């Protein structure tokens, strides 16, 4: 009924060890990730109806998954287990200077067309670009964005976008681009930024409102805040710098449709409690 | 020149925790793994010629094994990085009394026709079971395995034959058998043996020599030693049952050929150094 997340599902094997490469790390811990997946824990955490779309395999991993997603009262119907593939797996270093990952792509990247009803039901659709990158599912997901679109469904779109998840043939940066334009909100950072429009702008990055953008588009600027804008006008979210966690921030955000206005980013902006309460 | 080991080379991430399933296992260790690849690190260091054919992927895990295979100093020619593939990677627990594994096969599987130099400067081939498993390593395995034989070179094969490995329409145990019939010698363990033969027989397994196994077979019991046969008399090595480690005992057997008599069997056995004794 409140947010429909699509997108990929995966167990994260982070290790802080601080080496070289990923390559001299000897100790790994197993987290529940992906990005979809976590915007929809929060948002439940938040206390809104959640349903996340994706795909895992039936392994101890899935299973592990999926116990997490029934803990936290995510509703599961358009979660697929595959039968058959390896449930997606991303190897992380995690350091200031220093990650490296690797992807052990499988289930996530073979979601299906099933449950489009879930949409019409919900009112927030939330879309990934991770999930766009390889060529099965990414079918399923932008069919799925269209069709959020057509129900007039309020459509967030995350342009994480980064070569290395496409196929050499493959476009990458005009299908980014192809939703950005038909999207109504979108939360680029200064790397998604620098890797779809080059380093060709500080902050005139947001002229993508432009590139077709539409709606509003808020950018991350990691440690010094925000910048969003409607076109109409550019705000810097906190004025004084001093004064990462888009998945939390996101969450925050999304959840700015209990209330009104985009002040929703402000919102948003102290659910990134990356702090420890809990 | 010694040695010429043919088989998987992967990455074991290992949970010790005490759990149920795997899908409990939240901290993991990463290892160098791959029997064929451990049996050649391990020859090395028992100061012999050896080169592993195997085939990783070009990441962080495939550089990895590739650093302690040049440490170790192993013959890394036949080796091939996939350009394209992941390095496989096994999940293993060790846990409970409920223990579990999962394999996210890749590179290894992919095991092209290359180097059948190798052999020829060798003079023992050795060849396991896990890489016959998957149908395109599988046939420049056995393809490796005539061509030894036909050079006559001395050959070993490691019988781990289990079904899940298997796909659903391929023999693999008359396979596993096609091949104990070809070799010198084998190491299949009880557990390799009531996966082939059922549990119709206790040690009688070893009438194997007439499963075509020809040469001899030394048959481990874990806890309690080896039986040995070549048909003309069987052995069980310590009579004292009071008085695992394959790789390592194999290892030390195919060490011993430096001297002579399959006596090496008992070389091989001082040669597995668990934590006890040294």
Same mark, same amino acid.
């Given at each position: 009924?409140?947010?429909?997340?699509?997108? $990929?599902?995966?167990? /994260?094997?982070?290790?802080? $060890?601080?080496?070289?490469?990923?390559?001299?790390?000897?100790?790994?811990?197993?987290?529940?990730?992906?990005?979809?997946?976590?915007?929809?824990?929060?948002?439940?955490?938040?206390?809104?109806?959640?349903?996340?779309?994706?795909?895992?395999?039936? /392994?101890?991993?899935?299973?592990?998954?999926?116990?997490?997603?029934?803990?936290?009262?995510?509703?599961?119907?358009?979660?697929?287990?595959?039968?058959?593939?390896?449930?997606?797996?991303?190897?992380?270093?995690?350091?200031?200077?220093?990650?490296?990952?690797?992807?052990?792509?499988?289930?996530?990247?073979? +979601?299906?067309?099933?449950?489009?009803?879930?949409? +019409?039901?919900?009112?927030?659709?939330?879309?990934?670009?991770?999930?766009?990158?390889?060529?099965?599912?990414?079918?399923?997901?932008?069919?799925?964005?269209?069709?959020?679109?057509?129900?007039?469904?309020?459509?967030?779109?995350?342009?994480?976008?980064?070569?290395?998840?496409?196929?050499?043939?493959?476009?990458?940066?005009?299908?980014?681009?192809?939703?950005?334009?038909?999207?109504?909100?979108?939360?680029?950072?200064?790397?998604?930024?620098?890797?779809?429009?080059?380093?060709?702008?500080?902050?005139?990055?947001?002229?993508?409102?432009?590139?077709?953008?539409?709606?509003?588009?808020? =950018?991350?600027?990691?440690?010094?805040?925000?910048?969003?804008?409607?076109?109409?006008?550019?705000?810097?979210?906190?004025?004084?710098?001093?004064?990462?966690?888009?998945?939390?921030?996101?969450?925050?955000?999304?959840?700015?449709? =209990?209330?009104?206005?985009?002040?929703?980013?402000?919102?948003?902006?102290?659910?990134?409690?990356?702090?420890?309460?809990?």
């Amino acid at each position: 009924l409140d947010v429909v997340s699509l997108g $990929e599902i995966l167990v /994260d094997m982070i290790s802080t $060890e601080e080496v070289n490469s990923l390559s001299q790390s000897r100790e790994y811990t197993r987290h529940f990730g992906g990005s979809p997946a976590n915007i929809a824990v929060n948002l439940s955490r938040l206390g809104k109806k959640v349903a996340l779309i994706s795909r895992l395999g039936a /392994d101890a991993f899935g299973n592990y998954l999926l116990d997490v997603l029934k803990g936290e009262q995510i509703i599961t119907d358009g979660i697929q287990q595959d039968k058959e593939r390896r449930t997606t797996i991303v190897y992380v270093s995690k350091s200031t200077r220093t990650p490296d990952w690797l992807p052990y792509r499988e289930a996530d990247m073979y +979601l299906q067309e099933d449950d489009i009803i879930f949409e +019409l039901i919900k009112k927030v659709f939330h879309l990934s670009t991770f999930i766009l990158s390889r060529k099965p599912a990414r079918d399923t997901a932008i069919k799925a964005f269209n069709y959020a679109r057509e129900q007039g469904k309020i459509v967030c779109f995350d342009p994480c976008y980064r070569k290395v998840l496409w196929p050499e043939g493959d476009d990458g940066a005009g299908v980014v681009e192809e939703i950005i334009s038909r999207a109504d909100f979108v939360k680029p950072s200064l790397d998604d930024a620098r890797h779809l429009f080059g380093p060709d702008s500080p902050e005139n990055y947001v002229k993508r409102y432009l590139e077709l953008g539409v709606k509003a588009v808020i =950018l991350t600027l990691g440690e010094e805040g925000v910048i969003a804008s409607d076109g109409e006008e550019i705000i810097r979210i906190p004025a004084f710098s001093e004064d990462g966690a888009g998945d939390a921030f996101w969450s925050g955000f999304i959840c700015g449709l =209990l209330d009104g206005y985009t002040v929703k980013r402000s919102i948003k902006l102290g659910n990134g409690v990356a702090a420890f309460k809990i």
